[PDB]
Scaffold this active site. Structure first.
Site, PDB file in Angstrom:
ATOM      1  N   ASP A 127      -8.430  -0.538  -8.038  1.00  0.00           N
ATOM      2  CA  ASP A 127      -7.930  -1.170  -6.855  1.00  0.00           C
ATOM      3  C   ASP A 127      -7.930  -2.906  -6.941  1.00  0.00           C
ATOM      4  O   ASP A 127      -6.836  -3.358  -6.176  1.00  0.00           O
ATOM      5  CB  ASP A 127      -8.777  -0.770  -5.692  1.00  0.00           C
ATOM      6  N   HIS A 180       0.829  -1.313   0.283  1.00  0.00           N
ATOM      7  CA  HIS A 180      -0.064  -0.093   0.204  1.00  0.00           C
ATOM      8  C   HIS A 180       0.770   1.382  -0.012  1.00  0.00           C
ATOM      9  O   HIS A 180       0.794   2.161   1.040  1.00  0.00           O
ATOM     10  CB  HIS A 180      -1.090  -0.075   1.299  1.00  0.00           C
TER      11      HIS A 180
HETATM   12 ZN   LIG Z   1      -5.760   0.606  -2.794  1.00  0.00          ZN
HETATM   13 ZN   LIG Z   2      -7.630   1.213   0.640  1.00  0.00          ZN
END
Ligand SMILES: [Zn+2]
Ligand SMILES: [Zn+2]
Length: 327
Positions: free
Chosen positions: A236, A78
């Site tokens: 995502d 991340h």
């Molecule tokens: Zn993400």
């Molecule tokens: Zn996230």
């Protein structure tokens, strides 16, 4: 007034910004760990966003660098590279033939900006971890979409740094609409919202219209925003739809992050999270389960929305699924 050779190699790589499977990791290297800044800059120029929204270029650069610096370099998944990837993937999804001329410049700006900030300042542990440790962030957000609320707050708060307000020339009207869309999109990246988003995506596929032929018909905010929400959620969760050499790199990183949380959980006797446990994990099995239950139902549904623009992506997902399965 001419590129260095490294800058030229970077530039030739960035010629693939409009394509699924850009080598974002090479771009991260070439750019001095500036994949988010250079990719966002390329995209904004590519889409004429600086002129359309009267964004001064030095302000855009300053903000991007600041944004990028608030991603954690010591977080394996991340991080700024993941942000860049989600940005560029949302960028490609936006250009799908079935969505041509559907979205306004402001909605386009919202989806890309939301992509860029959507994981900023991620500590590399999950919401549940933060809630269970009685962490300051969890208490600020009453245990509710803790990280996602935090990403938004940081992403907006950073516009207040010196020469960072890239929205300085938008009207109050543009800014209020942009802000709401950005907030709706990022909050939708919380996986606890996944089942509902997918439900609504399906419903819209069941009841979808097409006008002037080809292009989809979206005639209320609810529908426009839910498509943008699902689009970014798709970006995502796009790692398994990318060529295998990219996907495996993402998987190594996500597993490094998960096991590390597993370690920290044990360094405190907490119950170990769903396959964050080193020793007792099957990376291959988890990827298959992940694809069968989450990624494939999502992308299959997306593919139907924009049929057949997404056929190649779905095929790649299935190939990667069989690949992992063969273990
Ligand atoms: Zn993400
Ligand atoms: Zn996230």
């Amino acid at each position: 007034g001419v590129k260095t050779e490294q800058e030229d190699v970077l530039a030739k790589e960035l010629e693939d910004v409009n394509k699924w499977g850009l080598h974002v990791f090479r771009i991260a290297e070439l750019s001095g760990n500036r994949p988010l800044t250079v990719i966002m800059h390329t995209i904004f120029q590519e889409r004429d966003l600086l002129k359309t929204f009267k964004i001064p270029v030095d302000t855009l650069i300053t903000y991007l660098m600041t944004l990028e610096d608030h991603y954690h370099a010591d977080v394996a998944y991340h991080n700024n590279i993941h942000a860049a990837d989600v940005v560029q993937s949302t960028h490609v999804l936006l250009s799908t033939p079935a969505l041509e001329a559907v979205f306004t410049d402001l909605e386009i700006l919202a989806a890309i900006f939301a992509s860029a900030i959507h994981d900023v300042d991620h500590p590399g542990v999950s919401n549940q971890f933060l809630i269970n440790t009685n962490s300051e962030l969890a208490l600020m957000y009453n245990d509710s979409s803790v990280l996602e609320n935090h990403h938004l707050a940081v992403g907006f708060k950073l516009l207040q740094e010196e020469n960072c307000d890239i929205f300085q020339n938008l009207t109050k009207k543009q800014r209020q609409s942009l802000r709401k869309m950005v907030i709706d999109i990022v909050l939708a990246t919380d996986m606890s919202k996944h089942m509902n988003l997918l439900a609504d995506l399906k419903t819209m596929v069941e009841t979808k219209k097409v006008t002037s032929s080809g292009v989809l018909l979206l005639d209320n905010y609810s529908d426009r925003i839910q498509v943008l929400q699902n689009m970014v959620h798709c970006a995502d969760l796009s790692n398994p739809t990318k060529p295998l050499q990219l996907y495996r790199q993402w998987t190594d990183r996500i597993m490094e992050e998960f096991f590390r949380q597993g370690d920290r959980e044990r360094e405190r006797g907490m119950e170990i999270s769903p396959m964050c446990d080193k020793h007792n994990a099957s990376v291959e099995k988890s990827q298959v389960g992940f694809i069968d239950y989450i990624v494939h139902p999502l992308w299959e549904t997306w593919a139907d929305l924009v049929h057949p623009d997404a056929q190649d992506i779905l095929d790649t997902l299935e190939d990667n699924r069989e690949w992992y399965q063969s273990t």
